[PDB]
C-alpha cells in the first residue's frame, strides 16, 4: 500500500544518513550530495517526486549490483518492486494536473535552496511544466520563500 524501500548511502561520510547522486545520474551536472536532515523526510512524505526518483535510482543501483542479470533483459523485477519504490498515485496526480491544464511535474527538473556557507540544502522539489514550458522562477517564488523560512526554522 505504501513505499518501503530505504536508501543506503552512508559509507564514507560525515553523518550516518544522506544520499549522493553521482555524475552519471545527473544531466550535465557533477556529483551532488544531500544531507541526512533532507533525505530523512523521504521516509515520511508521500507527495515528493524527488524521493520516488531517489528510491528508483537506488533500486536500480542495488539491482544491477546484487542480482545476476539475465542473458536477455527482464521486466518482472520492476513490475513487482515499483509499488514499494514509488507512489504511483503521485504519478497519477501529475497526469491529472497535466490533463486539466494545471502545471505538473514530469520528474525531470528539480530545485533546492543551498546555503552558501554551510552547504545545507533543502529536499529538492520538482520544477513544474505546462505544455512543455518550465515555469519561471517567479511563478513559485513564495514557495521558495516558504522553504527558506522552513530551513531557517531548522
Amino acid at each position: 500500500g505504501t513505499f518501503t524501500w530505504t536508501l543506503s548511502d552512508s559509507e564514507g561520510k560525515d553523518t550516518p544518513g544522506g544520499y549522493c547522486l553521482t555524475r552519471w545520474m545527473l544531466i550535465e551536472a557533477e556529483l551532488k550530495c544531500f544531507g541526512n536532515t533532507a533525505v530523512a523526510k523521504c521516509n515520511e512524505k508521500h507527495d515528493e517526486e524527488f524521493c520516488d526518483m531517489l528510491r528508483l535510482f537506488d533500486f536500480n543501483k542495488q539491482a544491477i549490483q546484487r542480482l545476476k542479470a539475465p542473458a536477455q533483459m527482464s521486466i518482472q523485477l520492476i513490475n513487482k518492486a515499483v509499488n514499494a519504490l514509488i507512489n504511483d498515485q503521485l504519478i497519477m496526480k501529475n497526469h491529472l494536473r497535466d490533463i486539466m491544464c494545471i502545471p505538473y511535474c514530469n520528474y525531470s527538473k528539480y530545485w533546492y535552496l543551498n546555503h552558501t556557507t554551510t552547504g545545507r540544502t533543502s529536499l529538492p522539489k520538482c520544477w513544474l511544466v505546462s505544455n512543455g514550458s518550465y515555469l519561471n522562477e517567479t511563478h513559485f517564488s513564495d514557495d521558495i520563500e516558504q522553504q527558506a523560512d522552513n530551513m531557517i526554522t531548522e
Binding site: 547522486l21 552519471w24 545520474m25 545527473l26 544531466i27 550535465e28 551536472a29 551532488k32 526518483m53 528508483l56 535510482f57 533500486f59 536500480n60 539491482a63 544491477i64 542479470a69 536477455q72 533483459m73 527482464s74 521486466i75 518482472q76 523485477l77 520492476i78 513490475n79 515499483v82 509499488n83 514509488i86 504511483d88 504519478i91 497519477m92 501529475n94 497526469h95 497535466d98 490533463i99 486539466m100 491544464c101 514530469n106 520528474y107 525531470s108 527538473k109 528539480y110 530545485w111 533546492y112 535552496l113 543551498n114 546555503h115 552558501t116 556557507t117 540544502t121 529538492p124 520544477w127 505544455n131 512543455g132 522562477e137 521558495i144 520563500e145 527558506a148 523560512d149 530551513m151 531557517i152
Partner: protein, 191 residues
C-alpha cells in the same frame, strides 16, 4: 538568485538513461513517432499514422504464446498497454502479426466513448513525457481525446538515439502498471 540573504536557489535534473538496465524508458522523437526502449538493444515503436500495415482482423495471441518466439519484455509491455485501455469492446479494432516472434500490433482509430479514445488515453499514459504534441488540443480534453491519425502501430525495434523531443522516463509505464485490468469489460461469465 539569493533568498533571505544566504540561501541560494539551485537546480537539479535527473538522467534516466541510466535506469535502462532495470526498467523501460518512454520518450518521443516527433509528433508521430514515440518509443519505449527496454534495454540498449530492443524496444517498441508507437507510430500514429494513416498508413496501415495489417489488412486482416486477426490477432493470434494463443499461437504466438505456444510458439514462444517473442521477447517476453516486449510482450509484457504490450499486455500492459492493452489491459490498460478503458472500455475496450471492439475486438476487430485491434489486429496483430506475431509470425516469427516479432511484435506488430495495429489499433484502428477510425467523439466520446470510442475505441480511439481508450487507445489514445493509454497511448498518452504510456508515452507521458512528450506525447501531448500528438493531439489537436494539448490539454483540457480527456474523454473526447481525438488525434487526426487513423492508426496506432506498435512494432518492435532496435535501440537508437530516438527521442529528440522528450527525455527518457519510466514514469508512464510505471504509472500504467497499476491501471492493468482496472477498467475492462467482461466478455464471458468466467474470466
Amino acid at each position: 538568485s539569493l533568498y533571505k540573504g544566504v540561501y541560494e536557489l539551485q537546480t537539479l535534473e535527473l538522467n534516466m538513461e541510466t535506469l535502462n538496465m532495470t526498467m523501460p524508458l518512454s520518450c518521443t522523437k516527433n509528433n508521430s513517432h514515440h518509443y519505449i526502449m527496454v534495454g540498449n538493444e530492443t524496444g517498441l515503436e508507437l507510430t500514429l499514422t494513416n498508413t496501415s500495415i495489417i489488412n486482416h482482423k486477426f490477432c493470434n495471441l494463443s499461437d504466438a504464446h505456444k510458439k514462444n518466439l517473442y521477447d517476453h519484455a516486449l510482450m509484457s509491455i504490450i499486455s500492459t498497454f492493452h489491459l490498460s485501455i478503458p472500455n475496450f469492446n471492439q475486438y476487430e479494432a485491434m489486429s496483430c502479426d506475431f509470425n516469427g516472434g516479432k511484435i506488430s500490433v495495429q489499433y484502428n482509430l477510425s467523439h466520446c466513448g470510442t475505441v480511439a479514445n481508450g487507445v489514445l488515453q493509454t497511448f498518452m499514459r504510456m508515452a507521458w513525457g512528450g506525447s501531448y504534441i500528438a493531439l489537436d488540443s494539448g490539454c483540457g480534453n480527456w474523454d473526447c481525446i481525438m488525434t487526426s491519425y487513423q492508426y496506432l502501430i506498435i512494432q518492435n525495434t532496435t535501440w537508437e538515439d530516438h527521442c529528440q523531443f522528450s527525455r527518457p522516463s519510466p514514469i508512464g509505464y510505471l504509472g500504467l502498471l497499476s491501471q492493468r485490468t482496472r477498467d475492462i469489460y467482461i466478455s464471458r461469465r468466467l474470466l
